[model samples]
Target chain A: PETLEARINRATNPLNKELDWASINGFCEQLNEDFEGPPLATRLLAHKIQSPQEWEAIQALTVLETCMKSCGKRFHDEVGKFRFLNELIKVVSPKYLGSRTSEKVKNKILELLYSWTVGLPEEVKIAEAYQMLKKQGIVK
Target chain B: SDDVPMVIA
Candidate 1:
């Protein structure tokens, strides 16, 4: 019986050195368990994704992307909120991490945001977030 | 690292 925290840690474990699909899917299931699950999971994931350890951040992003894909509109609504998007923006914004953030992490984030804009067009805020990055010259 | 496609089919 894995707790949500355990599921999250397994999915985003930096030491794994590769994406763990089982762990990621488990996390998505947890996030879909109840109405409050998505917000709680997103909060936890934002903390992991902001870690100073680049590999951990990358792995966390991978889990986040997988959750977005598998968890449906409920999860999308939570992610689309500016509250969560701002947390992601902080990872790449010069005013936040600046040079401390690795290029790989930054690129992955930009790629995810752009892809969401194309694939989940109904989430207007995702596009707004991506556009904000462009206008701020954070991404081209 | 190889790209793990985000949009899984």
Candidate 2:
């Protein structure tokens, strides 16, 4: 049986240089399953189990954008949602991910974060998220 | 469209 963890490991191995947008898309598909039933909260924690920060952040952001679209006005559990987003932001932030990340990829991260943060209530929406990125000077 | 001039690392 091909598990999501196995596929992620295969793609992120340093030996493999083929992990790019197509790889990101493929991984995002598997990630969407992480939030599906069987246990949404537990699956949310699995979001943290993703590895190779750079690669996993890309996949996580892609999935976050998709999940945000269907979440309606606000997430049921804001703490859980933002916790994951904050971690994703830390790894993807221009300060850390920086020039190692190309402009196109940065743009995608921005797009997803914009959608993810913008959809929440004004107070919760920007406070923590904005603070996290700003603290790192990622979003001055 | 699968390819781009970028490194995933």
Candidate 3:
């Protein structure tokens, strides 16, 4: 599952294209079930990018964004799901993305961040999420 | 999943 998901991200780069929601959701649910939460699952995926490939500041940014794009809603739906939301905000901290990344890449990151914040009935979660990125300077 | 070839950046 790990290798397969990584292949999709590296091979397809879902950021610029339409997402494979099934592939994204399937792996996401599996990761959530296995890793206990989105945070740990995402951490594992991030490390997966490093151990197998050469380490860089943001080697797995696209993959990570894709996974969140895929599974963040599941995190919101599952029991104790808000935990994943908190984790998602922290994972994309500006210290990781930085100012050096490409505008297109940064825009994709911004899109993922916004996705996590919006589409919910309540404004609280969305507001909190938007604030976190703002604090990190990931968004205006 | 579809096997469509994605345009590479």
What DockQ does each prediction reach against the true complex?
A: 0.03, 0.03, 0.02
Candidate 2 residue lDDT tens string, A1-140: 34555554444444545545454344444544544431342244235323345555454444445444453332334323544444445445545445465544456655555554656545353345655555655663
Q: On a 0 to 1 TM-score scale, where does candidate 3 land against the true structure?
A: 0.44
**Chain A alone, TM-score per model:** 0.94, 0.46, 0.45
- Would you estimate the TM-scores of all the predictions? 0.89, 0.44, 0.44
Model 1 chain A poorest ten-residue lDDT run: A66-75
Q: What digit string (tens of lDDT, one per residue) describes model 3 on residues B1-9?
A: 111221111
Identify the superior model by lDDT, candidate 1 or candidate 2.
1
Instruction: Flag regions of model 2 displaced more than 4 Å.
Output: A1-50, A53-57, A72-82, A93-107, A122-126, B1-9
Error of 3 at A111 (Å): 1.2
Q: What is the lDDT for A119 in model 3?
A: 50
lDDT of 2 at A130: 52
Candidate 2 docking quality: incorrect, acceptable, medium or high: incorrect
Compute the lDDT of residue A46 as modeled in candidate 3.
45
Every candidate's lDDT: 0.82, 0.45, 0.45
What does candidate 1's lDDT look like per residue over A12-87, in tens digits? 8879868888998888888878778888888889999999998788888988888888637778988887778878
Q: Which is the leading candidate under TM-score?
A: 1
Where does candidate 2 chain A have its weakest 10-residue lDDT segment?
A: A37-46
